[PDB]
Structure formats: structure tokens, C-alpha cells
Design an enzyme around this catalytic site. Structure first.
Site, PDB file in Angstrom:
ATOM      1  N   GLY A   8      49.012  32.524  44.998  1.00 44.84           N
ATOM      2  CA  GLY A   8      47.940  32.626  46.453  1.00 44.84           C
ATOM      3  C   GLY A   8      46.939  31.928  46.519  1.00 44.84           C
ATOM      4  O   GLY A   8      46.311  32.020  45.080  1.00 44.84           O
ATOM      5  N   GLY A  10      44.582  31.061  48.355  1.00 49.58           N
ATOM      6  CA  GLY A  10      42.996  30.905  49.649  1.00 49.58           C
ATOM      7  C   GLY A  10      42.122  30.722  48.374  1.00 49.58           C
ATOM      8  O   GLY A  10      42.401  30.038  47.486  1.00 49.58           O
ATOM      9  N   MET A  12      39.330  32.084  47.208  1.00 53.25           N
ATOM     10  CA  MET A  12      39.851  32.865  46.312  1.00 53.25           C
ATOM     11  C   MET A  12      40.613  33.018  44.825  1.00 53.25           C
ATOM     12  O   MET A  12      40.485  32.578  43.684  1.00 53.25           O
ATOM     13  CB  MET A  12      40.115  34.625  46.451  1.00 53.25           C
ATOM     14  CG  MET A  12      38.522  35.191  46.861  1.00 53.25           C
ATOM     15  SD  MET A  12      36.755  35.007  46.362  1.00 53.25           S
ATOM     16  CE  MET A  12      37.235  36.629  45.096  1.00 53.25           C
ATOM     17  N   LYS A 189      37.348  49.179  42.728  1.00 49.01           N
ATOM     18  CA  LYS A 189      37.078  48.512  44.061  1.00 49.01           C
ATOM     19  C   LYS A 189      36.935  48.524  45.660  1.00 49.01           C
ATOM     20  O   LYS A 189      35.878  48.972  45.873  1.00 49.01           O
ATOM     21  CB  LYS A 189      37.606  47.466  43.950  1.00 49.01           C
ATOM     22  CG  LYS A 189      37.648  46.173  45.056  1.00 49.01           C
ATOM     23  CD  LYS A 189      36.695  45.778  44.692  1.00 49.01           C
ATOM     24  CE  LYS A 189      36.092  44.912  46.191  1.00 49.01           C
ATOM     25  NZ  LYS A 189      37.390  44.450  46.059  1.00 49.01           N
ATOM     26  N   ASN A 193      33.466  48.746  47.705  1.00 49.75           N
ATOM     27  CA  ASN A 193      32.863  48.323  49.041  1.00 49.75           C
ATOM     28  C   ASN A 193      32.222  48.911  50.654  1.00 49.75           C
ATOM     29  O   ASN A 193      31.340  48.835  51.288  1.00 49.75           O
ATOM     30  CB  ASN A 193      34.798  47.768  50.006  1.00 49.75           C
ATOM     31  CG  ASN A 193      34.413  46.215  49.098  1.00 49.75           C
ATOM     32  OD1 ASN A 193      33.703  45.803  47.913  1.00 49.75           O
ATOM     33  ND2 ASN A 193      35.455  45.232  50.137  1.00 49.75           N
ATOM     34  N   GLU A 196      28.842  49.256  49.798  1.00 48.39           N
ATOM     35  CA  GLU A 196      28.168  48.367  50.510  1.00 48.39           C
ATOM     36  C   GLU A 196      28.313  48.216  51.639  1.00 48.39           C
ATOM     37  O   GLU A 196      27.215  47.593  52.457  1.00 48.39           O
ATOM     38  CB  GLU A 196      29.384  46.771  50.029  1.00 48.39           C
ATOM     39  CG  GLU A 196      28.976  45.927  50.594  1.00 48.39           C
ATOM     40  CD  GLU A 196      30.410  45.031  50.563  1.00 48.39           C
ATOM     41  OE1 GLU A 196      30.906  44.650  49.298  1.00 48.39           O
ATOM     42  OE2 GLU A 196      30.570  44.278  51.710  1.00 48.39           O
TER      43      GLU A 196
END
Lengths: 311, 317, 317, 311
Positions: A8, A10, A12, A189, A193, A196
Site C-alpha cells: 500500500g 499511497g 502514508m 485511534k 479522531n 479531534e
């Protein structure tokens, strides 16, 4: 020093490969998208043209890190597990829901493979400053993974020590944390968020009140406030200084009226409220932050028409 | 370097005098409570045993700072204004509502006295670290006051510079700001507090979700059997996460000291309410600021009657 | 049977006069807008072309009802009070804030005039069905006014009796109520409106969820493929469900007429805001009343600036 | 006129059997709890001592109605389906989540059995006034069920006709409604309850503001209001008259200070918010109503301690 496969590529995935390697680890990368794999080969990183080659290139016990879209994960595991071996570790560092981790970790355990969930915070800033890491899974795997986490995390220097922290052990001060058994990493996590969203909503609403302070007893609303300056002043000495405030001050500096900026949301906010509801925890602030994003896309529209209708 | 009179010698007033002195200014203090003045006198700061000696000791034009209760302000002004003189400056640095600064500023101006509102943030930490200062009132007076604010504020060094600030001037980077005409300092400080309520509520609610992650109604109890370490989790969020902040630093410290917070009804001091009132007048949506406030209300049981009514309806149907 | 002067000849004022007349009372009307008076004169109701003739035509002690804008009230009182007399009664039946009734009642009492506040609910439906009336002010005046309220109110027949009411007296069962001293009628009407906002928001949000039940992010699209008939569903809820109400009856009527409401920004008239202000002062949690209000704010785009800031933060990180 | 088997003889199940039979239908009842079965036999209603006898006593095509706890349903279907026959109809009238209906209806269809979901509103009042019914499933089954629904529902006389309703067909005016394919019934029932929470919360908060109107500018809060009388007056001529208001007025009449009354919640409220979140529909009011019930049980406690801590 270790060998880490990354699937993967991408932003990140590619950034974590850059940080890992800059930190002395060996990386093999793979992606369904050959241009993506080739971008990293152009940077001197070993590639693989298939899942078979990728598994071939990784010495046992393997460590496989996944940074693929959530909906791609199960198919990924299906295609790959028959080439994996007992004692291998697979890590899902992406945005997967923790209940999927619990099921996945179960299936992988039936083949002697340990499945580790990692919630990653930091986005594009992680490359240079390190990522905050919330880790779920079996203790043995996580301990074997320690050198990878140390490279990825910010390290204690990223912030002043909490008075008395010397009273405790573990890695919390380094910016990564084994949160619990399978799922616990993504679970922490998710809530990260959700929080956040709440923090951003609190600043946003507050600044919106300042922005309307000239609404004009109209005489009590005739203030023309400088939001860029106000957010700047709050960065020093106030109770509400934060990274999010720092970002607000930057944006507002560039564009005092944000005229070159409908807010999307990626799931963790949603999953946070669902967990609140399952647990019976009041979540007014977190949910309203979420709902503000929904209404910003006009999803309130039909409710609004009914209100006009009745009235 | 300046002479500053300070009235109100509680923790905040005493601390600003200590900071003021330590930064090279000349302070004369006073408080209706003599024990308080004496305590500062023992520290070797000039005192006064009456409003009269206080004003007497301050050379004109005077600079007078108030750190008294909001409720005591108007009567402090009634009492001392007859001893003051045109071109004097009076600063209200406490938690007054800005609409009162507007009225007060008008009264004082009729006597040639400039009335300045300062919303101060930073609390007990201001002594060593400097106070964030939000200032309303006439430009001339605020400029005259610049040396006092500089001393009181944290200074640019307290945080890294915002990319692009070299493109701008003014004092914002120092941790003090002239926000606007009379009332503007307290208006901005009010909203700061409203935001602060929202921020604390976000952390608290989220930590409460983590706290209940071992709840295992409940369809799949296996999905809620996490015993999470909230002290560690808040600590880990301080480095590399999107949500690091001063409030997190504090949450981490409290949880380190008390993982179950067992030695701990939430009060609210007014600015949170005033913020929601401003929102309502302005037509600004304020779901999260208001809900953070209301949670404080219900934490004191003020929801009790609404709750009994719901139980009763349930009984009815 | 009584003589009642009515000032303010908009829909509501005209309708109460029609109901008043039709119920056997003698009305004299007046409005700054002559076209309006004439229209009622054509209906054969006594008019007046000036405040002077109006007061002249009303036999003492007078009963004067105001149905003017809130903003016009004080100046209507300044203008007509010099023509009024001790023992006259003035009623403000419009949407005034109760704190203004308290002040106004005091001013008028100094001239021997009794000032009565009436919060009226029921709108256009009041003419045929009677208005719910919430009344504040002195007992003596409210008792003197009883025949006017009886005529105006729906009467007990409008709804089945609450099991146990034979145990109690007063007028509550008739659809009017003396709520307390000056301001109490408007205080209660205000909260009625706040509740009304909350109730409409509950229906609207729920219907919006049903409206989106065909949304099929989205983990299992097959779980959201319902095309639901909102007209039918609201209709079916009117019989046998826990949530039947007048507001539902209205929702059903609107949805029958327009299943997609395509010919339809939500305004708010003040009472909703005032309700939240009272809640804040009182320390009462008000999540749902406030959120229903805020949804109206964002429906007008007043959230726009908060939204751009969130987009910008996202851009930043 | 039809034969209906009922399994689950709590208050609702037993009440629906009484209404059905009083309406001319024939009922066979069953329950794991023999005293429950025997209570109804004492009232002249046919019982059954097992699931085998129950199925034996019902003539094909059968109609089986379930009013059992949600968590009992799947086990119920497992024990019973092997004695059922193609063309049978099974109805779950209980408090099941609609996604379970969708799965269940699928499995039953594989054996030629049509599974119908019914959301029931009305509780103890349904016996005499009829129940509001929200029906999901295949059209053919639902049409065959029509005589049962007609007996159970209030009938059009329960309320004035909506002006223009003659412009439409269907049964909505009778108090029962085929809402859609499998699940739609429970889906509409869920949202019904979510709305109900919101309505109750709106009255509750509002009356709480009245209750505190004597908080005493203290001079503006010196009202001693009569809540019983105020709710009574609102029943006539106001915009907010409703069944829920009627209930509030009754309770307050008995106990002006509700001193002989922590609010529980049964699931549909929770499921409503979860559906809002999946759909991206703003749900401030509905969610806050829910969260008020959570906090009323003290679930806010830990968040409150943290607030005190930070401060």
C-alpha cells in the site's frame, strides 16, 4: 535493524517506508499499482511485482505492514496468507474498524500468524516528526516489533516530560503504546479522531462567535475582531493552546476570511459515536461535532424543509 | 519602567504584582482585607491601609489595576474615582462581563479617566510563564500601558513562530493583544473560556468512552473487553498526535496522579454562559460549546427534575 | 359581555376581534394603517381614526388589547397612556419578552393602570378553535378579564378530561391560565415556543433518517435500500402510536401535499432564543431545545465560517 | 377470521391474543414458561406444552406470531423451522433490530417460509385502542395477513381524517402500514422510538426551565409556576398538544414534584442514532435525548471527574 515489507504505497505507506529506511531498516514494497511501486524503486527501495514475489523476498519470520484502503484488507489477507508461514507477523496500520481486527486476528492465529493492529496519527508530518502509534495485539509480536515502532515514533524529545513520569515504565513517553489485545490499537485511534472532531468543532464555533461579533442591543455587537491575531495571541499563555490552534492561526494568517475553502469525514468520528452508544456513554460534544460536518454538506436539507413546511 | 497600583490581592493579583516587580516595575498594593496587604508587605511590596493612602501614593497620571470579584467592581469605582484625576488609567483585569465594561468606560471617561478591560488567561502559571492578555479600550491608553503588558505577557519565546508572521506586526506574537474598543478584551476572553469548555468536554467524553471500553443490551460483549490505561494513552497522545494541547498535558498529569480520579460536581464561573448568550444573540450555531456547559449543569443534578418527568412518562405509558 | 378595544389589526388581532364579536362582546378597533381598520369596518366592526377617538370611544374602566409588533409596544404606550385613566386595563398579547412586561407593568401601575401580559398560542386556528392563553399580572385585573378569556379560549370540550381533574379547580381545563404576576404569561409562552422548537426538530430529524434509508463509507449498502413513504408513515403514526400530536397532524398534512417538500432556510422569531437564555441563567441543561434552535441557525448558513475553518484545518494537517 | 399461533406470553403477547380473540380469531399460545401458558388457558385460550405440539395444533398454511425477547428469537426459529412447512408465515412482532430481520427472512425463504417483521406501538393501551403497526416483508404474506392487522389496529375512527387523504389508497389511515420489504417495519418502529425520546426530552427540558423559574438579575426569576396546571392548559389550543403532553399532565397532577419517581432505555433509541450516523443524517436532538438518559444513570460520572481534575 529489521526487514519490513510494506503493501500500500499511497502517501502514508510511502512516507513510512522513507522514515523506516532513513532509520536503518530494509524495506520491500508492493502495490497493485505498478507506477506506485516504481516511484519507490526510483528512490532505491526494493520492489515486488506480485504478492508471490513480495512474500518470496521477505525472510522468515516476516513482518508485513499494510497501508491499504480498509475495504481492500480482507482480500489482501486472502491472497497472501497461503504464502505466509507460522511465526510471521502481519500489521494493519490503516483505517480499519477494530471489530474487523478481532475477527482477522482470529483467522490468522489459526495459521500461526500474529496479526497486529496499529492506529497511526500524524499524517504528512510523521515523515520528519514521527507518528503517534496505538498498538493492539499479542505481547510477543508487539515486543518483537519494538525496533520498528521506535523508528516510527517521535521519541521522548518531542515534548517536555510529565512530572512524575519516571514513576512508570513502558513506552508511552516515546509516542507509541501497546494499548491492549487485538483491536485495542484501532479502538484508541478511533476515539482519538472522535476527540479531534470535538476539539476542531469547539475552536470553529468559538471563532464563529467572534466572526459575528459585529452583528450589530446592537450596540453590544459592534466589534470588528482580528481572528488571525486572536488565534495567534492564544498560542502563548492561554489555556487553549494546541496543535489544532497552531493550524488555525496559520490558515487564518493566509486567509483572514477563508474564502478559498463542505466538510467531509472519514469514519473514525462515526465509529466513535457508535461505540459511545453501545457503551451508554454520553457523547453530546463528539456527536454534535460529527453532525456539524453532515449538515455542512447539506444533509440537514430535508429536515429543514419539513421545518419550513410545518411552519 | 512604571508605577502600578494593584487592588485585589488574591492569588492572581499578588502573582501579577510579583511578576510586575520582578520585571522592574514599582507596585503599590491594597485590599479591603488587611491580612492580605500585610502578607505582600512582608514580601517587601509597598502597601496602603485605605483607598485614600493608596491614591495618595500613586503619582499622576496613575495606572490602577483591579483584580477584585466582578461583583465588587462598581463599588470599588464609586469609592475611589473621587480621589482619581483626569488622564489616570484604570484597568479591570478580572472576570467582568463586557457589557459592564462598555457602561463603566463611559462613566469614567466623563471624568477624563481612561477605562481599560483586560481578560487574562493562564492562571497560576502566569507568574513564571506570563499571562495571555486580551485588551479592550482606547488606543492611547493601551499604548501608554505597553511596558506593563510586555512584562506580564509570555514573550515570543514561549512558542515557535507561525510561518508567515514576519509579514505582520503588532503584539500578537508576544502573548498580548489590543482586541478593540472598550469591552473587546473581556469579549474575547469570554469566548476563550467557552472554547475551553468545549475542549475539556471533548477530551472528557472521549476518555469516558475509553473508560467504558470494558463494558462487556450489548450485542457483542466480546467487542468491549478492553481494560485501557488512560494515563498511558493521554501520555502517548502528547507526542505525534493531532490532539496534543495544554489541556491534554493537564489531563495526563491528573491521570498519572490519579488513574481513577477517585478523590474528585463541576462548577462554571460565568464566561461559559455568557459565550452561549452571545451565540444566541448573534444567531451562531453553538452545539458543542452549549453542550459542554449543559454537562456541567447536569453534573450538579440540575437535570433531576427533567429526569423524574421522563421516568413518570414511562410509568404513564 | 364587555367592550374591548383592540389595537393592531393584523391577522391575529382581526381574528380575536372576530371571535370576540361572534362570542357577544363589543369591540372597537384601531391601527396606524387605515386600510386595515377600514377592512374591519367593512366587516361592520366599530373603528377609530386616531388614538384619541379610540380612547374616547371606550367607556371607563377601559379594556385595551394590544396585538402590535414587540418593537412598537413601548411607543404605543407612550402615545395612548396620557388618554387613559386609573382602573383601566391594558393587555399585551403579542410576543414581548417578559422582562419588558415587568418594567412596563411598573410604569403603568404608577398611573393606576393595570398591565396584563398574555402569551397566546394557536395562531390562525384560534378563530374557530380558540386560543391557548397564558396570563400574567394582578389577580384583580385577570378576574375582571375572565369573560374575555373564556370567549377567546377553546373551552373544556376541546380535549378529553385528565383523570383526576375533578379534584381541582381554576381555569386550566378551559385553555386559559393565570400563570403568575406580571411577565408570567409571556414567560410561559416563551418556553412553550422553545418546547415547540424541540418537538419539531425531533420529528424533522427522525423523518430525515427515514428519508435517507435508501442511502445504500457505508459498510453494508444492502441495509439501506428502503424507499419509504413518509406521507404514509406520518399518517399511520396518528393512530395508536406514542408520538401522535398536533405537530404530527401538520407534518402529515404537509407531506400529503408535498411528498418531497420541493417548493420549500428556517426563521426563528425570538422566543426560542429567549428560552435558551433563561435556561442558561437558571443552570438548566437544554441540549435539545438549544440544538433545535442552532439547526435553524445553520439552515440559514450561519455555520458557514465555522465550516470553512474546519476545511482549512484539514488542509493544514 | 383466522388461526394465529402466539409464542411469547408476556404482557404484550398475552394482550394481543386477547384482542385477536375478542376480534373473532382463533389462537394457540405457547411459552417456555408453563405458568404463562396456563394463565391464558385459564382464560379459555388453547395452549401447547411444546413447540412440537404448538406446530401440530396449527393448520397449514400457518401464521406464527413471536413476542419473545430479542435475544431469544434465533434459537426460537431454529427449534421450530424443522416442523414448519412451505407457505407458512412467521411474524416477529418484538423488539428486534431490522438487520436481523433481513438475515432471518433470507434463511426462512430458503425453506419456503415467509418472514414478516412488525414494529408495534401502543403498549398496554393497545388491548382496547389497538396497536399502531409498522410492517415489513413480502407483499403476498402481508396481504394474507390483512385480517389480523385489521383486528390489531385502531381503525380510522381513532382520529380525524387528514384533509385530502381520500386522494390516496392503502391502509395508512387504519393505523397499520406495509412499510417495505423485510426489515422496513422494525426500521420505521426504531425511528418512531428515537423520535419519541426527542419529544419527551423537549417537554422535560422545557418543564425543567419552568421548574427553575424561581431561581431568583434574580428579580427576573421569581416565578412560582404551577406545572400541573401549565401542562393542563397546553392540552387545549396550543401548538404542542400531544399524547406525551397528556401523560405529563396526568403524572404532574398526581405528583406536582414527581418525588416518587434514573431513566433506562431499551435499544431503539440507540439504534436510531446508529442509523443516523451510517446515513450521515444530523441527529443532534435525538442523540442528546439519548445521552440525557445515559447521564441520568450517572454514566457521565468519569467525564465529570476529569473535568474537576483538569480544573
Amino acid at each position: 535493524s529489521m526487514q519490513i515489507g510494506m503493501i500500500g504505497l499511497g502517501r502514508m505507506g510511502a512516507d513510512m517506508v522513507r522514515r523506516l529506511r532513513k532509520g536503518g531498516h530494509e524495506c520491500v514494497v508492493y502495490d497493485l499499482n505498478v507506477n506506485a511501486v516504481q516511484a519507490l524503486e526510483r528512490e532505491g527501495i526494493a520492489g515486488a511485482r506480485s504478492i508471490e514475489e513480495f512474500c518470496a523476498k521477505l525472510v522468515k519470520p516476516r513482518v508485513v505492514w499494510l497501508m491499504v484502503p480498509a475495504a481492500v484488507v480482507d482480500s489482501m489477507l486472502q491472497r497472501m496468507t497461503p504464502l505466509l508461514a507460522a511465526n510471521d507477523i502481519v500489521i494493519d496500520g490503516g483505517n480499519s474498524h477494530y471489530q474487523d481486527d478481532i475477527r482477522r486476528a482470529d483467522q490468522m492465529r489459526a495459521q500461526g500468524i500474529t496479526y497486529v493492529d496499529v492506529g497511526t496519527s500524524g499524517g504528512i508530518f510523521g515523515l520528519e516528526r514521527g507518528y503517534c502509534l496505538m498498538i493492539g495485539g499479542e505481547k510477543q509480536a508487539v515486543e518483537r516489533l519494538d525496533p520498528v515502532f521506535r523508528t516510527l515514533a517521535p521519541g521522548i524529545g518531542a515534548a517536555p516530560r510529565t512530572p512524575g513520569r519516571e514513576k512508570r515504565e513502558g513506552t508511552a513517553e516515546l509516542g507509541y503504546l501497546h494499548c491492549g489485545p487485538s483491536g485495542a490499537g484501532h479502538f484508541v485511534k478511533m476515539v482519538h479522531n472522535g476527540i479531534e472532531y470535538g476539539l476542531m468543532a469547539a475552536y470553529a464555533e468559538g471563532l464563529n462567535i467572534l466572526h459575528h461579533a459585529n452583528a450589530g442591543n446592537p450596540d453590544f455587537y459592534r466589534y470588528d475582531l482580528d481572528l488571525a491575531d486572536i488565534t495567534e495571541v492564544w498560542r502563548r499563555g492561554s489555556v487553549i493552546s494546541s496543535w489544532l490552534l497552531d493550524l488555525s492561526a496559520t490558515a487564518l494568517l493566509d486567509s483572514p476570511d477563508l474564502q478559498e475553502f463542505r466538510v467531509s469525514d472519514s469514519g473514525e468520528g462515526r465509529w466513535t459515536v457508535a461505540a459511545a452508544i453501545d457503551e451508554g456513554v454520553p457523547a453530546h460534544v463528539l456527536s454534535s461535532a460529527l453532525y456539524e460536518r453532515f449538515s455542512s454538506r447539506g444533509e440537514d436539507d430535508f429536515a429543514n424543509r419539513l421545518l419550513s413546511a410545518m411552519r
